[PDB]
Design a binder for this molecule. Structure first.
Ligand SMILES: CC(=O)N[C@H]1[C@H]([C@H](O)[C@H](O)CO)O[C@](O)(C(=O)O)C[C@@H]1O
Ligand SMILES: CC(=O)N[C@H]1[C@H]([C@H](O)[C@H](O)CO)O[C@](O)(C(=O)O)C[C@@H]1O
Lengths: 496, 495
């Protein structure tokens, strides 16, 4: 009954369908694959710094575009030859659609309602893809002409250094112009403010004033949609994506508790940025913080699954690891599982054959129950500027020392197998090199485990967990080593 | 005004007054130094594994004691000769009080009320000092005879490994026996459950069931005190010390939000363990979590001030650093500043001459305003088992890389001087660092000669444009032209 919110990005559909002259019927058929699943809402993203539809107030993706021209034309000149082919796939498909009088978002919204899906618009509030390239096709002329409106002018270390400063009147107006058009153009059930693209909206040190500013912004949005409710003849929801921990959220100027209490939002998505999906997010704390407000709390998953920030592995979640994350987060009180970057091609799970099963299982503890799952230890990629960072992995154990790892494994396991699995980096061990306990109970050595993707590129050792040791929620791996060891991976595999 | 809660520990008074035959009058005079200050409550701790008063349900500190005997006697045999002198100071003074018919806690409670101080009892729920020594004088016989009731039987790496497991009925009963006695023996305004001595109460991995167990415990205590309200003819408060961050609190089986919502507690003290004061605690998050519950949220200071867990420096807070922490935590919404280990001698601020001034200033932003203060970067000493730890220092900056440190400096500074000061561990010039605060370039000042507490490595000062500083967090950003390791960071605000 919690169900899935699925986010469709502003570029994917155009990139993957490029080269086809799309009919209204084919455009509609994209919604259909999500019909009869646990998907309750599609969050349709129509923009980055530019829109993928023919905006009157912002730059469409195709502003500057020469449809008949060569790839080497001014709009694409800044990219290498090979990347112009991909960018032009997006620009051209978005352009051609408009030329045929097909508004892709209007069609998706209409088809959503026919298929019992609640259609949302999700706006990227501060996308900064490729801002190292000032000439790049997908920057707004407004961004290009106004470097004084940026967040960090004293350095350029990260893309977010060149993000818009929402402390400025003219930055808020620029984003409110697009919202006023989206509300007028599209008859959506809900608007989501996607603050987590890229989650950095304020001069470093100005986040507290930023918090009062985004609350007022959110209130302007809520007021505007209230007017549209009387016009459309139905309720319109307002939602937001925010960081995964309340202190990080408040530290980036997102006081979601105030937004909830003053009735500005009725859905909140707690999410990482992109580096890895968080398999561990303090859902129960947010639920306490949001008590009485009537806000739907969604737990946001990302497609990547990576053990630590500096890992060179860039593999996606599998059905089994999404089953783990989803079982965990629903067990903690998530009222929705929200998928970001889990699309039907290119930006999607590596085991794409499992996409339909995933959409029919991860939205309920009932449909996850008795199915194989993996609870993998990862990390929170997003922290407020100068906020101390708590990153579990990698973890050194010196001879005779103890290390502990708490992994959230949601519902108590049904009868069957539980393996605590630990990856060791740097080249190794015997059957008595490690002592492994779970909630204090000794775990028997199993030997090397042949993991399916996602998996580390170093040996993973399995330890058999006495079924009855496992408890609902967090479960504690403790390890001591007789030799210095570095851990690069931890998970629970539960196969009932 | 928010005001001060001050904790007197179970041993201090006995250790420091040892060798004097104490009169009822002198015992009473201890309360007097706190009268007419911002202290609203004295939290009088009467126990560890043993009581400092003559309990009939627990071991007094002097169980086993031979008053006329030599230092080398069975009760103290396990200590080296010179440590028996200190321990025996505590045991003998506590014993001799009882022999004179002086109940120190009954006298303190009475004298508190005469002097307009609200008197509390603060019970250590699981003290584990010196549990490496199974024959130690301060361990209870119950603890000694029941090693099966301990938290960790598979290893002994930390004192908390030999803490009692409150997952056991026998452990809960044992601690409830003392609470039943304290409620009957003493007419206190409030009982505080000091969970933060030592904050580890459950088998590793059983903290969730632990949370339901301490809620039921706390509720049992609340029901007990409700009965005593009708006998004593006045309200009795129930309070608790808990970890500084909500996730850590819930992770150690302390669901204080439930305790607050069900009206089991009406005071909560967020605090670190002992390694250092936390100058940065999520007060505003707790206030949101506690909204409508009527619970007073107290921000707990510890006496030590240390930049990171492995630092060999063990210096205390000064008047100036306590002013900084207090200005910060009050600014964030603390309804009380709570002092732990800020006593009148031995366990005390090293600038002891400033103790009376401290007790008249740190309870109100009004009395802190326009006074010199230091906002020092530290760390949270306490994390749930296997919980990822966020420790800011020490911090390496590679050539051409940026590091940031957010320090909470509470109220925006008055007219005067603001210095960002950065300590370098393990050779720099005036351009080796670029330092910004909230993006504004800060002038190199050179080496700053800090007063204690201070690192044993060079501290460089950077002049902050007064107007850059904001209310609450303020952001130091630094880039280095040479590989450097920071061991220290602070704001000095001198109006
Ligand atoms: C690289 C690619 O093809 N698509 C990517 C898009 C585009 O970069 C973006 O939509 C341009 O506006 O961004 C994401 O959705 C994102 O932000 O997480 C990830 C996705 O993989
Ligand atoms: C002289 C001395 O060491 N006293 C210390 C006492 C005793 O060790 C304890 O009361 C034994 O029961 O403990 C503390 O208050 C504590 O827990 O932080 C600190 C204080 O410095």
């Amino acid at each position: 009954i919690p169900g899935i919110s699925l986010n469709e990005d502003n570029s994917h559909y155009f990139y993957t369908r490029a080269g086809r002259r799309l009919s209204a019927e084919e455009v509609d058929s994209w919604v259909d694959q999500y019909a009869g699943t646990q998907v309750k809402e599609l969050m349709l993203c129509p923009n980055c710094m530019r829109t993928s539809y023919a905006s009157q107030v912002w730059d469409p993706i195709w502003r500057g575009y020469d449809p008949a021209g060569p790839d080497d034309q001014p709009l694409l000149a800044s990219l290498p030859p090979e990347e112009r082919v991909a960018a032009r796939g997006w620009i051209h498909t978005a352009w051609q659609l408009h030329q045929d009088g097909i508004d892709i978002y209007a069609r998706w919204i209409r088809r959503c309602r026919q298929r019992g899906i609640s259609p949302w618009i999700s706006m990227r509030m501060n996308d900064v893809h490729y801002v190292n390239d000032e000439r790049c096709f997908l920057h707004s002329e407004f961004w290009r002409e106004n470097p004084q409106l940026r967040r960090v002018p004293y350095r350029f270390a990260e893309w977010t250094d060149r993000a818009f400063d929402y402390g400025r009147a003219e930055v808020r107006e620029h984003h409110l112009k697009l919202i006023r058009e989206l509300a007028a153009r599209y008859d959506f059930d809900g608007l989501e403010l996607d603050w987590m693209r890229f989650g950095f909206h304020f001069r470093p040190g100005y986040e507290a004033e930023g918090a009062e500013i985004l609350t007022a912004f959110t209130a302007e949005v809520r007021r505007l949609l209230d007017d549209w409710e009387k016009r459309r003849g139905h309720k319109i929801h307002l939602g937001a994506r925010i960081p995964s921990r309340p202190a990080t959220a408040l530290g980036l100027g997102m006081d979601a508790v105030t937004w909830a209490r003053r009735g500005l939002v009725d859905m909140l998505v707690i999410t990482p940025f992109w580096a890895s999906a968080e398999t561990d997010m303090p859902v129960e704390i947010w639920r306490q913080l949001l008590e009485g407000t009537g806000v739907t709390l969604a737990a946001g998953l990302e497609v990547l699954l990576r053990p630590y920030p500096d890992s060179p592995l860039f593999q996606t979640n599998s059905l089994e690891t999404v089953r783990g994350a989803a079982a965990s987060l629903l067990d903690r009180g998530a009222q929705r599982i929200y998928l970001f970057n889990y699309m039907d091609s290119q930006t999607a799970m590596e085991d794409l054959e499992n996409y339909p099963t995933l959409l029919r299982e991860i939205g309920s503890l009932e449909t996850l129950a008795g199915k194989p799952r993996r609870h993998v230890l990862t990390f929170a990629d997003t922290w407020a500027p100068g906020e101390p960072r708590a990153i579990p992995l990698p973890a050194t154990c010196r001879p005779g020392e103890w290390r502990a790892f708490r992994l959230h494994t949601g519902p108590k396991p049904e009868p069957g197998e539980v393996i605590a699995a630990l990856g060791i980096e740097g080249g190794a061990i015997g059957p008595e090199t490690l002592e492994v306990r779970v909630n204090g109970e000794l775990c028997a050595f199993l030997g090397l485990v042949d993991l399916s993707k996602p998996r580390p590129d170093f040996p993973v050792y399995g330890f058999s967990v006495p079924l009855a040791a496992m408890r609902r929620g967090y479960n504690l791996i403790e390890v001591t080593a007789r030799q210095e060891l570095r851990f690069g991976w931890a998970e629970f595999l539960i196969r009932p």
